[PDB]
Amino acid sequence: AGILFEDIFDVKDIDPEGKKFDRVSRLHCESESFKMDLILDVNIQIYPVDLGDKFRLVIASTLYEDGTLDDGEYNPTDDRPSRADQFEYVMYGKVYRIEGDETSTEAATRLSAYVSYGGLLMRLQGDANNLHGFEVDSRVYLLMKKLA
């Protein structure tokens, strides 16, 4: 397994403020079901994306998904573990903080995930029940695939 988050997202906005980077846009996405607010920086020229497209967003601690760590090294000869290749767009990054609305006594009911994919950042807000899998300073894989 090794899966941290699984949901289907819809793109509501692209450039609420503007086009700061030509090759990188910021997907402002609202999710069905879980009601997961997502902000994501996606490289555009390699993986184009426009408004209002259903894409499956998958957050996984490992790509093999059989329960083994990836040791954080790039080896193209690692096909034999049957890496999860069902997704068109794959990112690797590191979550750098977890923010929530908890204050002293009461617990956090809603959390926000801050993951940096080597500079491309993402915010993931929603109820903490399904977002509890994220731990600060842990390697995270982002998986994307367009849907009809």
Region binding other proteins by CB under 8 A among candidate stretches 2-10, 30-38, 54-62, 81-89: 81-89
- Which of 11, 29, 61, 70 binds other proteins (CB under 8 A)? It is 70
Q: Give the DSSP letter of residue 130.
A: H
Q: How far apart are CA 131 and CA 36, in angstroms?
A: 10
Task: Tell how strand 54-60 and strand 139-146 pair up.
Answer: antiparallel
Q: What is the DSSP string of 4-30?
A: EEEEEEEEEES-SS--S-SSEEEEEEE
Identify which of residues 19 and 35 has a Cβ nearer to other proteins in the complex: 19
Q: How far apart are CA 131 and CA 144, in angstroms?
A: 18
Q: Is 102 left (phi over 0), alpha (psi -120 to 50) or beta?
A: beta
Q: How far apart are CA 66 and CA 89, in angstroms?
A: 20
Identify which of residues 10 and 37 has a Cβ nearer to other proteins in the complex: 37
Residues 13-52 that bind other proteins (CB under 8 A): 17, 20-24, 26, 39, 41, 43, 45-47
Residues 118-147 that bind other proteins (CB under 8 A): 118-121, 123, 135-137, 141
- Which of 33, 72, 80, 148 binds other proteins (CB under 8 A)? It is 72
Structure tokens at 106: 């009461």
- Which of 98, 113, 131, 140 binds other proteins (CB under 8 A)? It is 98
Rule CB under 8 A: which residues touch other proteins? 17, 20-24, 26, 39, 41, 43, 45-47, 63, 70, 72-77, 85, 87-94, 96-99, 102, 104-105, 107, 114, 116-121, 123, 135-137, 141
